[PDB]
Design a protein around this nucleic acid. Structure first.
Lengths: 77, 27, 59, 58, 19, 67
RNA sequence: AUGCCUGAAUAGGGUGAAGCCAGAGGAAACUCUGGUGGAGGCUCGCGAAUUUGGGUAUAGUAGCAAAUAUUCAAAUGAGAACUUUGAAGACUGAAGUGGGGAAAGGUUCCACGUCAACAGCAGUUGGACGUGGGUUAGUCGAUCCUAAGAGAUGGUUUCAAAGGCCUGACAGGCCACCAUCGAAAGGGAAUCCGGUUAAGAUUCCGGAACCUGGAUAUGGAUUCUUCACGGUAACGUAACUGAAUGUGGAGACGUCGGCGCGAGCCCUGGGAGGAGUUAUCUUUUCUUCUUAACAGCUUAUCACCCCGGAAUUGGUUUAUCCGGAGAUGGGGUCUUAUGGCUGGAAGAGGCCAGCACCUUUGCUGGCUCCGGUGCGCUUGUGACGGCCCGUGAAAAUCCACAGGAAGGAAUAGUUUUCAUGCCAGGUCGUACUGUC
RNA sequence: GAACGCGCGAUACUCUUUGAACGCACAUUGCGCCCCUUGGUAUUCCAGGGGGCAAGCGU
């Protein structure tokens, strides 16, 4: 499995011809400041690997979710 | 276990160390 | 009324060995019909087959 | 706490090791008093050099 | 070395009979 | 074998001693007109060969067993 | 009797040899005292003996087949001391009466029915009988390689015509050396976790990943048009052509000792759950709080490089070894073994609580957190020191280096050890038990 | 003659694996090479089938 920090790379991954499904996973976890927050993992598998994008920002995750292709199947959790 | 199956005759007479059969003499 | 296989399956499913499983003496007929591990799991869930705890003995 | 190697050796090899030690001690004690058991260096020292041998012959 | 391998036996024999 | 057929989408066949996985796959494909995902073969104690032929998701093994 | 090849083992307690450090006596040599160090024909539990697997040479009498402890209630059954469940008593006590393997056995594995025979009483029980079910691999082994040795060819490469390759609008040229067998413990490309059966698992299912071979396409580089740069250096890189020929590395190699580090186990504090005991005392005793292969970033003792030139000799190990053949000191380069963070991955696994049913009767909600410790056991590893000794088996296999043959440009020049993309992986073993 | 199967051999109440036994090995269902042909995207890959492999310094 691979991790990617690039949002547009993830979007390019989800835009290819051989894309099956994308998984959106939510984790309720605390940061070093002690205040808990919501972390979102976007997972899509390419040719031979599973690429994961981890976002600790809620607004960015919402924008990325709204920017996903409308013909792409998305697994919630 | 000094002997094993002989391919030519099927008896338990093939000496493993000598690689020869004591019943049909193979080969 | 031969629950040897039932005890074996219960020990395997719960994973606590045959010395920790408890088969209900008042439910021999019900346990006798548990010929599969799914039925053993059902019996464990219903409480007919129970898992005994580790002995309380100081180290 | 006993080590694993100690347990393995004491379970496997202790008896024959002790027996061989006993046999070696017995043989050494038996041949301690015998006459005719010398090392090669001692035999050479008793033999002496060549010049010592012409000295002895004279 | 062994340079005789430059001549086969028949050649060597037929040249020995020449002598 | 029938449990595997109805659940695992796998057809269990008996094949010859002289057949390999390529031949079993090709024979299943030709005789039953199905796509073979994989073939796993073993040799039984009674001197016969048993093959588990898993078909692709495009085919239902229950339908092929009934047909 | 003496061997040879490849593996396992060569342990522990005690004592305390050289060498070294600090002292005292003496002009040296030396001798005492304390420490350190960890060696041996040291001890402890002509002769004899000298661990081990695989391979390979030269009268219903004697008596009960001997391995201790059984008791109570219920179920089945014609029949119960011997079958099953529960309760009690007892045993093995990790060097097991516990879980696996090689060899060997061959269905003894699992289910259903049975007691004619067998399991030296009995038996409704079975390693018995009868009928069925069961062993799934690109990644684990064999298959490949060679070891001692065996053994074809004409005794093991020998007075053998013993074979492949290259060049060129049939001739010429290059090279030497022998088949094959022999290891499921030696060398070797690559797979992990969770779940699943009456009996199958690194093989099945789900997820995740690597290895080898092949054809090809795209991007990038190959910067004026033609095989790229940087740093004093060690060396760094997204690439960055390389024939014959000649070399180098890995494979690939004795044993022992202490020291340093990592991991698993053990010990332990707080807290979040569950269980036991409570006439009295006991913030108490038990148990859960886990993170795989693989992948990205980062992280080194040693070694090496540059500056510099050292006695008032310094540095320094537990072990007195190092320095003008360049120390101390200052600044750098490298191997990634091994830690850390992250993806895999919490969705898994675990511990709880609650709500559904004469039924596959599964639904829902929480917690799965933060630390400490070492003459501890197991194991891996680094730099050393000691002793023996052929500089410590071979081969398959992969890589690199010298060398400069050849090739490369105007409507897609050459190369593709950089990146991404496609396809495939046959035969045999796999159930069960188990002299090393 | 032997092994495995249904007197017989996958055409089994034509002739499997062998055996003097013949591509090489062999206590293995192990390892190759050559010619034709067929299929799966196919000039390369993979697989199936058929048939095979015990010159001279002489005149």
């Amino acid at each position: 499995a691979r991790e990617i920090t690039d949002i547009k790379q993830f979007l390019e991954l989800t835009r290819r011809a051989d894309v099956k499904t994308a998984t959106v996973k939510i984790n309720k976890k605390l940061n070093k400041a002690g205040k808990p927050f919501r972390q979102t993992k976007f997972k899509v598998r390419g040719s031979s690997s599973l690429y994961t994008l981890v976002i600790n920002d809620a607004g960015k995750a919402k924008k990325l979710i709204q920017s996903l292709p409308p013909t792409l199947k998305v697994n919630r959790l | 276990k000094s002997h094993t199956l002989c391919n030519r005759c099927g008896r338990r007479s093939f000496h493993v160390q000598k690689k020869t059969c004591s019943s049909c003499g193979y080969p | 009324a031969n629950l040897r296989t039932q005890k074996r399956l219960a020990a395997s499913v719960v994973g606590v060995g045959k010395r920790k499983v408890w088969l209900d003496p008042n439910e021999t007929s019900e346990i006798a019909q548990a010929n599969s591990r799914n039925a053993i799991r059902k019996l464990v869930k219903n409480g007919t087959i129970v898992k005994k705890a580790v002995t309380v003995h100081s180290k | 706490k006993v080590s694993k190697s100690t347990k393995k050796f004491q379970s496997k090899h202790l008896k024959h090791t002790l027996d061989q030690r006993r046999k070696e001690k017995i043989q050494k004690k038996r041949i301690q008093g015998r006459r005719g058991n010398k090392t090669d260096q001692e035999k050479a020292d008793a033999a002496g050099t060549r010049e010592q041998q012409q000295l002895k012959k004279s | 070395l062994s340079r005789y391998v430059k001549w086969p036996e028949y050649v060597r024999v037929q040249r020995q009979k020449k002598i | 074998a029938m449990k595997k057929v109805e659940d695992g989408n796998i057809l269990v066949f008996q094949v010859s001693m002289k057949a390999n996985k390529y031949q079993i796959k090709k024979a299943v494909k030709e005789l039953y007109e199905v796509d073979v995902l994989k073939v796993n073969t073993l040799v039984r104690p009674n001197g016969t060969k048993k093959a588990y032929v898993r078909l692709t998701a495009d085919y239902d093994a229950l339908d092929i067993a009934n047909r």
